[model samples]
Target: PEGPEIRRAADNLEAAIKGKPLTDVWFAFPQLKTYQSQLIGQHVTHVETRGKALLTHFSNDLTLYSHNQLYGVWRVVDTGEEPQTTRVLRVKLQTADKTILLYSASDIEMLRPEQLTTHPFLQRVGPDVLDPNLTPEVVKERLLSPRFRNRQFAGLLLDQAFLAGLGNYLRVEILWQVGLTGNHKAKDLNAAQLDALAHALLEIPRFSYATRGQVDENKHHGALFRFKVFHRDGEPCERCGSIIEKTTLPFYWCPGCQH
Candidate 1:
C-alpha cells in the first residue's frame, strides 16, 4: 500500500474511535496479551502514519504502532463480524460501535509519546513525501543532505533516511521520469539535474499515491497505461524506440529515454 492508502485507513480508524472509550480488547497473539488490559478503558485520540507505520494514539499516554511490512493489514469493522482474510489475527480493539482488527503484523507494540522520537524505526525515517506540510525547500534540502551525498541515485531514493514512503516501484518511475539512470552518483548530479530529480521525487509519489501506486504514463480509451520502465523488461520503451532492459538489481529502464 502507498502512503495515501495508509493515511486513508488511519483516517477511517480515527473517525470510528473518536473520543470513544475502548469497551473491550482482544489479542489473538499471546505475546501481546499484556496490552489487552492496558488498552481497555482508554479513549482513542487519533490515528496517523509516519512512513509506513501506523500510530494509534490513546488517552493513557500510550500509542499502538504497527508496520505492515508487506503482509500486515488492519481492518475497521463491526463487532462479531470477521473480515475475509487468511492472515493470522494479531489484535482486536472494540469501542462502543466499531471493531479494529490487525492481522499478520508482528511488529505491533505499544509505546509512550516520549519513546516515538527515538524508536529504532522512527528515528531513522526522514520526512514523509506525502506530508501535507512538505515544501519544495525541504525536499531540496533533504535531497542534498549528507545522508545522500555519497550514495548512488537509485539507492539514494530508496533510502528511508533520505525520504520516507518510497518503495521499489516508486524509485524506478521517479528516476525514469527525471531522465536519469540508477548508476549516477548523487554527489555527481549537476544543479539542473538535482533540481529535476528533486521535483520528480516530490511529484511522482503524489501522483502514484492518487493512483494507488500505479505510475501511469497515460490513460487510453478508459484504460490506464502505467510505468515507463518498471517491470517492463523485454518490452519496448514507451518514450523511445529502444528495448527496455533488466538488470541484476531487478530494475528495469530504457537506455535511450533514461541517461
Candidate 2:
C-alpha cells in the first residue's frame, strides 16, 4: 500500500471505531493477550498515517502501530458478518455494532504516546506528503536542498527519508507529469520543471485518495488509467503522442517530450 491507500484505510478505521468503546479486542499473537484486556474498554481516539505506517490512537493514551509489509488489509463490516477470506486474521477490534479486522499483517506493536515521535517506523520518515499543511513551495525547496538535489529520482523517490508516502508507481507518474525522466537529478531541473515536479508530487497522491484511484469521480465518465505512465510502458503518453518508455530502474516516462 502507498501513502494514499494507507491514509484511506486509517480513515476507515477511524470513522468506524472512533469514540466507540472497544467491547472486544483480539490479537492473533498470544503474547499480546494482556493488551487485549487493557484495550477492551478504551475507545479509538484517532487514526493517522505516516508513509505506509498506521497509528491507531486510543483514549487510554496508547497507540497501535502497524504496517502491511505484504498482503495485509483492513476490513470493516457489520457485527457477526465476517467477509470470507483466506488470509489469517491478525488483529480484530469490535464495537457494539461493528467489527474492524486486520489480516495478514504481522508488524504490529503497542506503543505509548511518548514513543510516537521516537518510534523507528515514524521517526525516520520524511515530511508527510499527505499532510494538509505541506505546501508546494516546501516541496520545491526540498527538491533543491543540498542533501537531496544530488540524487536522481529513479532511486531517490523510493527513499522514505527523502519524501515519505511516495510509492514506486507514484514516483514514475510524478516524473512523467513533470515532463522529465527519472535519470535527471533534482538539481538539474529548471524552475518550471521544479515547480511542476513539486505540484505533481503532491497532486497525484491526493487525487488518488480523493477519487479512490479513479481519474473521473463520475465512474461512467470514461474513468480508467489514473496514471499517465506508471505501468503503462509501450503506451502513448497522455500529454504527448510519444511512446512511453520504461528505462533503468524501469521508471516510466515519455521519451519524445520529457528531458
Candidate 3:
C-alpha cells in the first residue's frame, strides 16, 4: 500500500543512506543472493523513484529495485544504533561494523540498467503528474479510446494508462471535489468535468505537500485530509453529511458516491 506519497518519503531516506559506507549486509530470507550480488561491494550514490517504486544506484553500475507491492515497509536507523523494532529484510553498512537494516520486504530485486530495454510496463505508464511525459492532448486521446470511454470515472482515474499516481483515495477525493459519483460513466463526463478531473490530477504532486509522508503531519497550515473513504469507514464525509461507506474489491472505489 505504499503509494507515491509513502514511496517519496522512502526515497528521501534512501538518499540519506546512499554514499554512506555500508559496513556490512544481513539477509534473513533466501533467494536474496540473486539480487544481493548486484549490490554487495558497490557504494550507493543515488536513489531514483518511479511511481510507487524505489531504485538505488550504486557505484558498481547497478540499480537495486524495490516496490511495496503490498505487505512491505522499511525503516532506517543510524549507523551504530540498533533499530528499536523492525522486521529485518536486508541490512547494509559503511564498514564491517556499521549497518542499515531493511525489513518486511515484499520484493527484494534488482534491475540491470540495460534490462529495462523498452519493457511494456515502463513504456505504457502514463505521465507522472509530478513529472509528466504525456501532454493534455495526449491524455485526451487516451481518454477517448473506445475501451476507456465506456468505463466509470472512478475506474478511469485508477487506470495508470490514463494518469499515474492516482490511487483509491485520490480518485474519490478528486470526484468529490467535482461533485461526481463513482458510477458516472467515462463518456458521460462533460468537457468541463473531464477538465476538472484532469486539472485536479495535475495540481497535486504525488509527494506530500508539506511533510514527506504525513499529510496531516503539517498542523500549522490548512489541514487537508489525505483520504475520504480510504480509512474513514464510519465517519461522515467532510463536505457532505452522508455516511462514509467502505468495501474491498480487487480494486477500490466508493460505492455510495463513485459511479
Candidate 4:
C-alpha cells in the first residue's frame, strides 16, 4: 500500500476509535512495552496521516506514530474476534467495541505532541500528493523548482521531498503518462511538459486510490504488477509494439514512446 491506501485504512481506524476509551494496549516487541499502559483510559482524539505514517492522537497529550513499511498493516476488528490473516501481530489497541491490530509492523513510536514538530521523519516529508494544497500549479512549480532543476526526471519524481507518496511503480506510470523520459533533467521540460507532468502526478494517484491501486486496464494485475512500463521489461509496449527496456535510472520504459 502507498499513501492513498494507508490514508484509507487510517480513515477506517479513526471511525472505529472515535469517542472510545483506550481500554487496553498490547505490544509484541519489548522496546514499545512502556507505551502499553500510558494511555489506558485516554480517549482517542483523532488519527491523522503524513506520507505513509499514521498518527493516532490521544487525549493524554501523546501521539502514536506508526509506519507500515512494506509488509506492515493495520486492521480494525470486533473485540476479541480473530483476524483472518496469518501475519504476526505486532501491536493491538483495544477499546470497548473494537480492536485496532498492527500486524508485521516494526516501526512504532510514542511521542509527545511537541516532539512531532522536530521528529526527523515527519519534518522532512514533502507535501502529500493527496493533499488538497497539492494543486496543479503547485506541482508544476515543484517540478521546475531550482531545488530539482538539475536532477534526473525519474529520480526527482521518486524523491519523497519533491512530492510525497510516489513509490517506484507510481514514478514509472507518471513519467509514461506524461510522455517523458528518465534521462531528461526536470528543468529542461517545456511549459506543456511541466503541465502534463503535474497532471499525471495528481491523476495517477487518484486513479490508483479510486481503483484500489489498479492502474492497468486489466483487473487481475495486482498493485505492483499493474504498470505500462514499470517491471514489464521485454514486454510489448501498450502504445507501440517496441519492447520495453530497463534503462540507466533502473526504471522500465518504452524507448519508442518515451524518446
Which candidate number has the best TM-score? Answer: 1
> TM-scores, in order shown?
0.52, 0.52, 0.44, 0.51
Candidate 3 vs candidate 4: the lDDT winner is 4
What digit string (tens of lDDT, one per residue) describes model 2 on residues 1-259?
A: 3645666777788778888999999989887778998888889978767677778888999888888887788899887777889889999999999889999999998888667656776767765678654679978876787868999888889988767767888888887776777678878888887888899889887776566544455666644437788778899987878888886536788898888
> Which candidate number has the best lDDT?
2
Cα shift from native, residue 172, model 3 (Å): 2.1
Which has the higher TM-score value, candidate number 1 or candidate number 3?
1
126-230 per-residue lDDT for model 3 (tens digits): 445554333455456556667467887767777776567667767666676666776776587788877776666655434334335445656766445365555
Model 4: residues with Cα > 4 Å off, grouped in runs: 1-123, 213-226
Task: Assess the local accuracy of residue 24 in candidate 4 as a C-alpha lDDT between 0 and 100.
Answer: 86
Question: Could you give me the TM-score of model 1 versus the true structure?
Answer: 0.52
Candidate 2 at residue 195, lDDT? 88
TM-score of 3: 0.44
Q: Tell me the tens digit of each residue's lDDT in model 1 across 1-259.
A: 3646767777777777758889888877667688778888998777756677888778888888888898888888887787777889887889878888889988888888778766888767766777644566767766676656677877877778777778888888888887788888757888888888877887887776665533453343322336777888888987787898889836778888888
The C-alpha local distance difference test score for the whole of candidate 3 amounts to 0.58
Query: Where's the lowest-lDDT run of ten residues in candidate 4?
Result: 217-226
Q: Residues 93-120, candidate 4: write the lDDT tens digits.
A: 8899888899998788888966876788
Ranking by TM-score: 1, 2, 4, 3
Model 4 CA lDDT for position 138: 68
Candidate 2 C-alpha RMSD relative to the actual structure:
8.4
Model 3 poorest 10 in a row by lDDT: 204-213
Better of 2 and 3 by TM-score: 2
Q: What is the C-alpha lDDT of each candidate?
A: 0.77, 0.80, 0.58, 0.79
Task: State how far residue 96 of model 2 sits from its true place (Å).
Answer: 1.0
Q: What is the descending lDDT order?
A: 2, 4, 1, 3
